[PDB]
Structure 1
Amino acid sequence: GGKKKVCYYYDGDIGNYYYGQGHPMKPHRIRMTHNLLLNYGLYRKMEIYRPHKATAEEMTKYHSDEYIKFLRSIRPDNMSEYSKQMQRFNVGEDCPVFDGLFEFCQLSTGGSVAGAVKLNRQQTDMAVNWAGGLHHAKKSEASGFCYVNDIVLAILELLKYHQRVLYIDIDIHHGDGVEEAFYTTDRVMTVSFHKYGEYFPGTGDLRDIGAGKGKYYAVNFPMRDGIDDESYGQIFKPIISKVMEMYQPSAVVLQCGADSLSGDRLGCFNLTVKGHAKCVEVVKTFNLPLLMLGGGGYTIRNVARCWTYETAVALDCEIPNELPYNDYFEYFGPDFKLHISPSNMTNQNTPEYMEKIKQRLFENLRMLP
């Protein structure tokens, strides 16, 4: 038990990067998150660090030299000359070229790798990088608004000191970039809960379980539209408890993508901030070194609420539902409260469905040594 030492990573420049008019990814939400939790006074309880800008050397621990060299070079002013290379690396539409793109990648990545180093040195119990969690980026390809996979890079850092690392992903989307990087090893177990069925990125079937040495070390829980706190609570603690029992990791990475929240502009789930944060509480109780990362989230007032509350959860610090004044106070109307209510959308996930999928995953976990 006991309260944990928390190190938190934030660069105030992050909020000034702009994906372009109408693009749903708003890096400003990270600044909103920071400003809200500062105004709750959570800076009194944790160490706040500014991450370094991760280097191309650091990024090619996973990504190919040619992809990182492209990301270093491409700019809005030289786009027309790179039209062939942009298609090769899936840059240009959902993953646009914008001013400062490579510096933006260096910032999100630097916080995750810095947090992993801090955990490796046993200088913190938990490290938090809300700017991170870019689980879709591939070895040589951007995808799903992500360019550089900070998670894979951070896990590679943890693996220097940890035989087994557990990755848990509560973003509404399948963590395909992370699962793919570690699909054939048993040194990382990936566990993703996600909407599945004609949904981005198209992977994460129940029956994708890993390959080779990694067979049974990939776990996927496919879900339907409208899942609520009750349905998620049916299955999250039982599955993570069984994973902990069988896999016995020595470090954990938790991707806390907030596009699984009720009312997300892009997502189709119905979780509240309390139900989302219950996952952090569950993982926290195993008392393992823990890297907590951001992810998706497109209704940015709810992103700020979610990650502020989950920072408080990490700190075992109770905070009031009445929002303190802050630089973005108008975003939180008309209620100006921290917690959110679910919508009346139908939950397509029946209780029988939840239990059945869980039972099938339990069968797979029995195949571990």
Structure 2
Amino acid sequence: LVPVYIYSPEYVSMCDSLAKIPKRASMVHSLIEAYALHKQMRIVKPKVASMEEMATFHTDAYLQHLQKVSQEGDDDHPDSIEYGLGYDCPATEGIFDYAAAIGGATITAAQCLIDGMCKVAINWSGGWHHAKKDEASGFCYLNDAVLGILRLRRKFERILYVDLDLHHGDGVEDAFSFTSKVMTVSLHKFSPGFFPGTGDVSDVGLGKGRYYSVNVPIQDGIQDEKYYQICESVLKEVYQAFNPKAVVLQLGADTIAGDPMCSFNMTPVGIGKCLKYILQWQLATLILGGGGYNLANTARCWTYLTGVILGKTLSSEIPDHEFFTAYGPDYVLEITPSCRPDRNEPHRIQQILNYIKGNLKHVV
């Protein structure tokens, strides 16, 4: 009944251990702990993913490469560019243990769901949706979202994956594009030159998986009310057509106003309405983080969302804690909307929604 919270001091240290990658995990946990929300949850220490468990999705060659680079390298390896390592996925020591930790945490969350320990299990340090079987991409060395889905698939026949990160969940979609057993639904920015470039409304999966991928392309500057209307429209149609047995929900906070991504104009309240809608299905739900690069804002967001999972309304005052100064100058939980135009034309949104509805008529 109480949500599972995947946490250990070791796990947070590991998630924060990569050189030059900013130290977000501790900020997120510390804020949740400052609000004492961990006391309302079942704190579960994550296992570390074994080679075999990561190999459920990732190829041997890619994993072995990740391990070699994690030990000795940064440069000096011929295969690293092809394996996707570089600027947005740096080759630095510990990347393999980092990946193992996050993969293991999400799998642990899934296992908790399978065992009926909880109906909601949270890994705020996961959601790394871009990684492919054989390739790192966009901060994702390992696709823990895919690993979570595959773990859930041990018990639950049909999984719905919902990706509310600013970016297209291409790695997860690709993993499951050829099957009807997993439906992926991604809302994301879709614009010429915008990472990773994929996820147009016309991308619907392939083969046995045709029409079991859903992509919702959204433009800059969308705010809470409009986003939720879109999200609810699509998810209502998805739930009725697909009838998921479990849900994996990726809640990247890079949609939030003030993010360096400077794209969407959301607040945690808007994302929270989407979360509430999904939670109301009362299915086993695995909650992941993802992007989120205004670190304080991301902690504000996921803390707030932890609150909605718990059905609690949190104080607007940020409580004193380790990273309190990071919340200045206002020291409040709430995020303001930037003064930025909403580039989403109602008519285009309706067209997109009509198209998805047409597609979902083939499900399933």
The TM tier, using the shorter chain, reads over 0.9
Give the corresponding residue for 1:99: 93
Equivalent runs, 1:252-271 vs 2, <5 Å = 252-271=247-266
1:13: which partner in 2? 13
* SS of match in other structure, 1:194: strand
1:201 aligns with 2:193: no
1:241-260 pair list within 5 angstroms: 241-260=236-255
Q: Which residue of 1 aligns with 2:159?
A: 165
Residue 76 of structure 1 and its aligned partner are, at CA, apart by 7.5
Deviation at 1:267, TM superposition (A): 4.0
Aligned length: 360
CA contact (8 A) 1:113 1:157 kept: yes
Kept after mapping to 1: 8 A contact 2:16/2:26: no
Tell me, yes or no, if the aligned pair for 1:231 and 1:351 is still in contact at 8 Å.
no
Aligned to 2:133: 139
- Between 1:226-235 and 1:73-82, the stretch displaced more is 73-82
* Structure 2: gaps of 5 or more residues: none
Aligned partner of 2:27 in structure 1 is 32
Residues of 1 paired with 2:262 and 2:49: CA distance? 30
In the TM superposition, residue 355 of structure 1 has moved relative to its aligned partner by 2.1
1:358 aligns with 2:349: no
Aligned equivalents of 1:7, 1:16: Cα separation in 2: 21
Q: State the TM-score, normalized to the length of structure 1.
A: 0.95
* Corresponding residue for residue 113 of structure 2: 119
Please give the alpha-carbon distance, in whole angstroms, between the structure 1 residues aligned to 2:360 and 2:317: 43
What CA distance in whole angstroms lies between the structure 1 residues aligned with 2:248 and 2:350? 25
1:143-164 deviation per Cα after TM superposition (whole angstroms, max 9, x unaligned): 0111000011111111111110
Q: 1:343 to 1:140 in 2, by over 3 A?
A: same
1:343 to 325, 334, 338: 338
Report if the CA contact (8 A) 1:135-1:176 is conserved. Answer: yes
Contact kept in structure 2, 1:14 and 1:31, CA below 8 Å = no
Instruction: Give the distance between the partners of 2:335 and 2:362, measured in 1 at CA.
Output: 40
Q: Kindly state the Cα deviation for residue 217 of structure 1 after the two structures are TM-superposed.
A: 0.2
Structure 1 distance, partners of 2:28, 2:159, is: 28
Q: Deviations over 1:267-296 (max 9, x none)?
A: 411001111211111111111000000100
**C-alpha spacing 1:248/1:80, structure 2 compared with 1 (3 Å):** closer
CA offset digits 1:174-198 (Å, max 9, x no partner): 0000000000100000000000012
Aligned counterparts, 1:168-317, within 5 A: 168-198=162-192, 199-317=194-312
- SS of the aligned residue for 2:76 comes to helix
- Asked if the contact 2:69/2:93 (under 8 Å) is kept, the reply is no
Indicate conservation of the 8 Å contact 1:17/1:99, yes or no.
no
- Higher mean C-alpha displacement, 311-320 vs 69-78: 69-78
The Cα of 1:5 is off from its aligned counterpart by: 2.0
Q: Matched residue of 1:181: which SS?
A: helix
State the SS of the aligned residue for 2:249: strand
12 and 118 in structure 1: CA distance in 2 versus 1, 3 angstrom threshold: same
Structure 1: unaligned runs, 5 residues or longer: none
Q: CA deviation at 1:19?
A: 4.0
The amino acid across from 2:87 in the alignment is E
Q: Is the 8 A contact 1:91 1:97 kept in 2?
A: yes
Give aligned-pair identity as a percent: 41
User: Quick check: 1:19–1:96 contact (8 Å CA) kept in 2?
Assistant: no
In 1, the alpha carbon distance for the partners of 2:144 and 2:257 equals: 26
Secondary structure of residue in 2 paired with 1:253: strand
Runs (4 or more) in structure 1 with deviation over 3 Å come to: 75-81
- Aligned-residue Cα RMSD (Å) equals 1.3
Query: In structure 2, how many angstroms separate the alpha carbons of the residues matched to 1:339 and 1:353?
Result: 30
Code of the residue aligned with 1:47 in structure 2: it is R
Instruction: Find the counterpart in structure 2 of residue 151 from structure 1.
Output: 145
Is 1:108 aligned to 2:93, yes or no?
no
Find the residue that maps to 1:192 and give its secondary structure: strand
Task: Find the counterpart in structure 1 of residue 42 from structure 2.
Answer: 47
Contact 2:71/2:94 (8 A) holds in 1: no
Note if contact 2:120-2:286 (Cα within 8 Å) is conserved in structure 1: yes
1:79: how far off? Answer: 3.9
Task: Determine helix, strand or coil for the equivalent of 2:359.
Answer: helix
Residues 234-282 of structure 1 show CA distances to partners (whole Å, capped at 9, x for unaligned) of 2111211111111001100000001111110124110011112111111
Assess if the C-alpha contact under 8 Å between 1:184 and 1:211 holds in 2.
yes
Amino acid at match of 1:331: A
Residue 252 of structure 1 contacts residue 289 of structure 1 at CA under 8 Å; is this kept in 2?
yes
2 CA distance for matches of 1:35 and 1:318? 18
